DNA sequence: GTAGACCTGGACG
DNA sequence: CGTCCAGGTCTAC
């Protein structure tokens, strides 16, 4: 009782709540789909990961996001570091307000909106971001989920460990930018990416201006941020919109994947209109990416993360 | 602006 | 056992 991942159930005083309806948020419909690769349903409808450096289980129930943290003593998180959380999901952000939205000036949102409520977007690290999206190119979310966690098993901090469950923080671009880097996540098996890892670390290291090069982005206009990351190695237009949109605070950025491609042709008969090409292209991606902008607005990335979402539970 | 190939490994035939 | 195929990016014409 004392060992192991903590349940709401097991441990009561131990959580604190923060008032979250189901409506504006469902862990099962967030965590595991593909914008961060680091949240485990370790016991069911639990959920333990990394978050602002010390490792949480969070659950809900229909009006309630109970949360527990493992930092020396156990206790119930406290309420700057329930802030913590508030701000990981951006809870400040009203979901309701947004499916509303989206939902009246685009039918075909409405109806996947019944089916999946609380599909809100992360507020990620910059760091952390950059390099598990490099993980996903040309890639599926389970083999891209073993890759980051091997990675940060391998070159980030060791935090506290439950059951067998050894927690590590989120590697740092020096020690990515490390000697034989490359070759160590060869062998975790991240293939060619492996090379990006390292040569995006040393770019941004030796050639940005480091850390705060891409901190700084979070002021910068989408437009910019896009184009700067660009620069770095394994990032295309594709896995930047994803650095832009889930953590660099560009909400109408919006990510062109297989996924959204086959959303855009099944469920909106979209065809290029401006592009030459007839499939997926660098101009063409461009082309829905300012369509789906145009159908949605402002946070179009958020309206992004719906549809990908429900199509991942399909 | 455009075909090809490219690490890895779980589903098709 | 052997081809797509997955939250694509890169580079040769
Ligand atoms: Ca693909
Ligand atoms: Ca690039």
Redesign the pocket.
């Known amino acids: 009782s004392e060992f192991g991942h903590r349940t709401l159930a097991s441990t009561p005083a131990l959580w604190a709540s923060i008032p979250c309806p189901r409506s504006e948020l469902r862990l099962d419909l967030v965590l595991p789909?593909?914008?961060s690769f680091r949240w485990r349903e370790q016991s069911p409808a639990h959920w333990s990961g990394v978050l602002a450096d010390q490792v949480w289980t969070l659950t809900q129930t229909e009006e309630q996001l109970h949360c527990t943290v493992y930092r020396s003593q156990a206790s119930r998180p406290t309420p700057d570091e329930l802030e913590a959380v508030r701000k990981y999901f951006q809870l400040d952000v009203t979901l309701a307000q947004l499916y509303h939205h989206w939902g009246s000036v685009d039918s075909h949102f409405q109806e996947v909106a019944q089916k999946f409520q609380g599909v809100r977007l992360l507020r990620q690290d910059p760091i952390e971001c950059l390099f598990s999206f490099i993980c996903?190119?040309?890639?599926?979310?389970?083999?891209i989920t073993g890759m980051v966690e091997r990675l940060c098993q391998a070159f980030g901090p060791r935090l506290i460990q439950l059951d067998d469950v050894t927690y590590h923080g989120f590697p740092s671009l020096q020690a990515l930018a490390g000697p034989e880097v490359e070759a160590h996540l060869?062998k975790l098996?991240?293939?060619?990416?492996a090379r990006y890892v390292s040569a995006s670390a040393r770019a941004i290291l030796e050639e940005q201006g480091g850390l705060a090069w891409l901190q700084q982005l979070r002021e910068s206009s989408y437009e910019e941020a896009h184009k700067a990351l660009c620069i770095?190695?394994?990032?295309?237009?594709?896995?930047?919109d994803?650095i832009c949109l889930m953590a660099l605070d560009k909400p109408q950025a919006v990510?062109?994947?297989?996924?959204?491609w086959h959303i855009a042709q099944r469920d909106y008969s979209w065809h290029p209109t401006t592009?030459?090409?007839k499939g997926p292209?660098?101009?063409t991606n461009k082309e829905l990416g300012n369509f789906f902008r145009s159908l949605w607005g402002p946070y179009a990335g958020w309206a992004?993360?719906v549809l990908?979402s429900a199509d991942?539970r399909q």
């Open positions: 789909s593909a914008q996903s190119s040309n890639n599926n979310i389970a083999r060869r098996g991240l293939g060619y990416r770095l190695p394994g990032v295309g237009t594709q896995v930047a994803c990510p062109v994947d297989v996924h959204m592009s030459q090409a292209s660098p101009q992004q993360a990908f991942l």
